[PDB]
């Protein structure tokens, strides 16, 4: 049920890029993301750090909470859902979000550009595939999808601060 | 019984490098204060404020003598005379013996190991890391975190507790334990506390919720919690016992990296006796 979400990678990342642009217009780090379970979006998020005054409200954390709400409302266990969910995110997850995704046992992340400041899938640390036997499961990555557009958003944001 | 051990990057954990300097014995002890004044006006040693300028020595009998730190050695650290090192009339060298080279710690000590190494060469400033009043306050906050962890244990939750403190007023801003559940698996104790500090903060606030604050947590934070603390910009963290996948000492040291835009101090061991019987994070 995982590779069935991969079929529409282009549609899902286009929506993630659309959300990233919104975040940029709202003076947030321009990261958009979608979580797809069986070719349906079960959660989405963009960075809400400055909106909420809370440094932990990265796009991925916002999307994780939406999927958890979806699981709670429809009486499905998070395990069965998250273990067959793909995350599409415009930017390499940071060290914190990479650890959250391991704890949720998300199997696959498709992401755009590298995260030079905080990346947890190899740029600063390799949390995604690290040997962390008490910290969920390692996940796999498909990096580089529309990285050029995504990193241009990042640079635009970091000029405006 | 407990002792607070700093958790430093691997770079700062090794031995301080040594630099060479000239000292001279004080043969007329009653010239000490005058010589100290005259020499330290000529050679203030601004780059080494951690070094005391007089080294006392006790003989195998109790008799005490002293050496005076004159100046750093140049590129050629050869034998030097008092006349070569000390200008007159700015210094009247009477009462000093012949200068000798001594290796000095180039930078102040941070660990106990470093302080012992340092003072073996020359008296250095800091004995112990925390004052009696400080240790009492730290034990009180960690006791509150232990009590939160034990409430969690009694309810069937992961036995991790945390307290956030504003050290400007020593007031507790948040107390929390792990609340993770099947429906909400990421409610680790640190994540709960950060959200508590966030909800109690003013309207014209920055998202760096933990700026300036101290965290007491029973056991070492996991990668998620540790990096949340980097993003939230905690100022210091005290924890009791390590965690196997811990990221503030054990498997990572994300608080002490040059390529993250925030570093902070971490100490382990606070009430470790009790904390080691509680749950690791995650
Ligand atoms: Zn993140
Ligand atoms: Zn944690």
Author numbering:
A (entry chain A): 14 to 174
B (entry chain B): 25 to 150, 162 to 237, 270 to 349
Quote the study on this structure.
We observe that the equivalent valine 128 in mouse ADAT3 is part of a large hydrophobic core comprising I43, A45, A47, L69, L75, L93, L96, V126, P129 and W146. Whereas the crystals with the V128I and V128M mutants, which showed stronger aggregation, did not diffract sufficiently, we were able to collect a full data set at 2.0 Å resolution for the V128L mutant. The same crystallographic space group and unit cell as well as the similar resolution obtained for both WT and V128L ADAT complexes allowed the precise analysis of the structural changes occurring upon the V128L mutation. Superposition of the complexes showed that both ADAT3-N and the ADAT catalytic domain are mostly unaffected by the mutation. We found that these movements are mainly propagated within the ADAT3-N specific structural subdomain but much less in the FLD, which displays a more stable fold due to its tighter packing.
The eukaryotic wobble adenosine-to-inosine modification is catalysed by the ADAT (ADAT2/ADAT3) complex that modifies up to eight tRNAs, requiring a full tRNA for activity.
